[PDB]
Design a protein around this ligand. Structure first.
Ligand SMILES: [Cl-]
Ligand SMILES: [Mg+2]
Ligand SMILES: [Mg+2]
Ligand SMILES: [Mg+2]
Lengths: 319, 319
């Protein structure tokens, strides 16, 4: 549907180049060959990591917190004095099935370097080997460990795509455990809700157009990670639950304008505002899902600055 | 493009009914016949006014402030204690050429009655008989009069469509006059910027699709009101100017998801956030430009509540 439009006239020349490379880099069909699929996205994430290391200077260490593998990503210059008593948890994307290692660094590096903060990126259990709520348990275990060193108000959690879904689910799991809620979250290109509204049609997630009979959208996320979880499970789909929505911490919702998640994120932001939760929504016209894993455009740097700015204004400072 | 989609699955049954009423209310072709066009929209605004008076109980008085005709719109039994020291200025839409009288009450009534506040709706000079900056001068004259009774921090300005554009232009005119900036504004379905990005194509403002050559979009607003004003006039187009944007007050940007203005509002929100201005963006998936002139749907009431809540949180309270 969108292929009939010119590129958004808001875009930098650099973004217009990225969009052509994104389309050219599209995966072939894998037909259930998970090993071939994982190898393709391992290469994709390694390619984006090379681009990140050209732009940003960071140091990464492996750690284990409460039996969960993490990578701790810091600016090579060191964390700023302002951020000495803050930390972010990153939850990587990758369709709930890949993104471990380089995909996690691709999300953590630009935010660690831009904000000047420590980012703990979680190597959570993946589908299809593991199922909901495995990733919630993993992120909550990391969060529990960081509460030994950082006040809850000074901890942020963010993730992109599948990671934005898991970030919202981790919040409800933290509450289920009786832990203090995090200071702020980023649910980027995804949250604790099914895809809905117009954007999945416009992005072609569901086929539509001349002579073509558009089906209703599912009220569940189709991923194997979520199979058999009901739409009524407020911990799994909190941005459809008035109760879990009221308990959300301050939330940043960021998407591309051509991102299949954007209709759901605009509704989530309306629900957070009605519930009295501090939330912020940004849309980058013309850009796709999870666009800011491609760092070679001003729009990605701009996104990193909005993420850094949100955490810098919402997280506590004091030890 | 959008006729191939089902209605957004987020919409209430009432909104799906309003969407069909909107289609039935669409103007026939006028061939530049301004008299016929004005008569058509007079009836359209009178029809929406009947619907407003069914839902909301207000009282309206005519006044003149600094030689500008206004209507003062209040809840029928009086303004709330919360809002005794606050006032909103409304700037009606109508393509800069109509909307005087009933069109202005259609924007003022739901916010007066929802927030429980006095709304002064300005009968500003229209195109093509008047040109930029006539409407800025008119709104600034009203603002200057209200500063005799209300602190600048306690005054909000809002408008829809053409009125959102004029609201942003009135802010720059107020600064030109050496007056204190208003406490907050609402630039709804329009701001001080051309329409841009993807949404003008998806809304069908400009033809796109098989066998059609989609043209580039203009860098100026095409209205007679703005004839001969340059793109480089930062007072006319403040949300395209990094200088005028840093001086903006706290801003609410609200649009339908199918609104031709939505791409421009998402960019204006990014620019306000980078300039450190408090701004809030809401998008109502599946709804068109200026949807909330139709009060008979929960989504309109929800929009009125977001407008009231933005002014309630940003305007001062002190006498
Ligand atoms: Cl916002
Ligand atoms: Mg432990
Ligand atoms: Mg808010
Ligand atoms: Mg803000």
């Amino acid at each position: 549907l969108m292929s009939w439009l010119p590129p958004s006239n808001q875009l930098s020349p650099e973004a217009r180049s990225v969009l052509d490379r994104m389309d050219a880099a599209k995966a072939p069909e894998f037909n259930g060959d998970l090993v071939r699929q994982r190898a393709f996205y391992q290469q994709f994430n390694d390619d984006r990591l090379v681009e990140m290391r050209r732009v940003f200077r960071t140091r990464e260490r492996h750690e284990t917190l409460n039996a969960v593998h993490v990578q701790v990503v810091e600016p090579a210059d060191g964390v700023s004095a302002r951020n000495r008593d803050r930390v972010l948890i990153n939850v990587h994307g990758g369709a709930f099935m890949w993104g471990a290692g380089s995909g996690a660094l691709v999300e953590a590096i630009p935010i660690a370097a831009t904000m000047g903060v420590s980012v703990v990126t979680v190597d959570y259990r993946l589908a299809p080997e593991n199922r909901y709520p495995a990733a919630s348990e993993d992120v909550t275990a990391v969060y529990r460990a960081l509460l030994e060193r950082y006040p809850a108000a000074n901890i942020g959690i963010f993730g992109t795509s599948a990671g934005g879904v898991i970030t919202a689910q981790a919040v409800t799991w933290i509450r289920r455990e009786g832990l203090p809620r995090p200071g702020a979250i980023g649910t980027l290109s995804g949250t604790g809700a099914p895809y809905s509204g117009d954007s999945p049609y416009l992005a072609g997630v569901v086929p539509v157009g001349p002579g073509v009979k558009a089906p209703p959208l599912p009220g569940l996320l189709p991923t194997a990670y979520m199979e058999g979880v009901g739409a009524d499970d407020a911990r799994a789909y909190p941005l459809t639950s008035d109760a879990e929505t009221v308990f959300m911490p301050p939330t940043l919702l960021l998407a591309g304008g051509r991102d299949f998640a954007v209709s759901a994120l605009s509704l989530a932001h309306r629900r957070l505002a009605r519930a009295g939760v501090d939330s912020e929504l940004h849309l980058f016209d013309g850009l796709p899902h999870a666009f800011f894993v491609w760092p070679d455009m001003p729009e990605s740097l701009e996104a990193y600055a909005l993420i850094a700015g949100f955490f810098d204004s919402r997280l506590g400072l004091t030890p």
